[model samples]
Target: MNKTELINAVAETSGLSKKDATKAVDAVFDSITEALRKGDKVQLIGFGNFEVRERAARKGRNPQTGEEMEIPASKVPAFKPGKALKDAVK
Candidate 1:
């Protein structure tokens, strides 16, 4: 679900007002983002983990012109679901 839907669910389940739920949801997201920016992993047992992964530089071709170019290496955010989450989905 999207952000609004998530906020609604949080509000319903936690008995929080919409405004409070919004703040709570935003705070959680911001915390995760801040941790990742600091090169730290955010792990929630039975849920998932968020971390940064390094992507190596590689050759890539432009779709339109088919011109080859070097794609620079970068650090990207990634997530891995925990066993509980994986099992729940399945």
Candidate 2:
């Protein structure tokens, strides 16, 4: 679901107003983003884990020009689904 839908679900389940739920979700997202930016991971039991992964530089072809180019390495955020989430999806 999208952010608004998530906020609605939180409001319904937690008896919080939509504004409060929005703030809560925003706080959580900000915390996770800050932690990831600092090269840290956030692990929530039964949900999943968020971490940073380093991607190695690679040679790639430009889709438009069909020319080879070197793509620099970069660090990016990744989320791994927990066992509970995986099982639930099934």
Candidate 3:
């Protein structure tokens, strides 16, 4: 679901107003981003873990042109869902 829908759902589940749910969702995301910026893990047992994975500079191919290109190193944010979440989907 999109942001507004998510906010509504959170409000329904948590008994909060839409505005407050939106604020809470924003705060949660901002905190996760801040932690990732510091290369720290943000873990919630029944939810998942948010972390940054480091990628080294590497060579890649330009798919359309079939030409070689260099890819700069970077840190990418990723999430690993907890077992409970995985099981719920199943």
Candidate 4:
């Protein structure tokens, strides 16, 4: 579901108004983003996790000239769903 739908769900589950749910949802996301920016893991046991992974530098080739180029290593954000989420989906 999308953001609006998610807010609706949260409001329904928590008995919060739309405006309150908006702030709650936004705060949850903002904190997660802030933590990830600091290279910290944001994890909820029954939901999922947010973390950054370090990638190794690698060689790549251009499609047209077939020339080799170096791909600089970078950090990548990753998510791994928890057991409850995994089981629920199936």
In angstroms, the error of model 3 at 17 is 1.9
lDDT of 1 at 64: 31
Ranking by lDDT: 2, 3, 1, 4
lDDT of 1 by residue, 16-68 (tens): 79999989988988988987777778888898888986556667876333669
lDDT of candidate 4 at residue 88, scale 0 to 100:
84
Off by over 4 Å in 1: 55-73
Error of 3 at 45 (Å): 1.2
What is the per-residue lDDT of model 3 for residues 1-90, given as tens digits with 9 covering 90 to 100? Answer: 888988989989989898899999899898998888877888898869889976566688763346698766557888888777888788
The global Cα lDDT (0 to 1) of model 4 is 0.78
TM-score of each: 0.74, 0.73, 0.73, 0.71
Task: Give lDDT tens digits, candidate 2, residues 15-47.
Answer: 989999999999999988987888788888998
Q: Whose TM-score is greatest here?
A: 1
Please give the clash total of every predicted structure, in order. 0, 0, 0, 0
Model 4 error, position 42 (Å): 0.5
2 or 4, greater by lDDT:
2
Give model 1's TM-score versus the native structure.
0.74
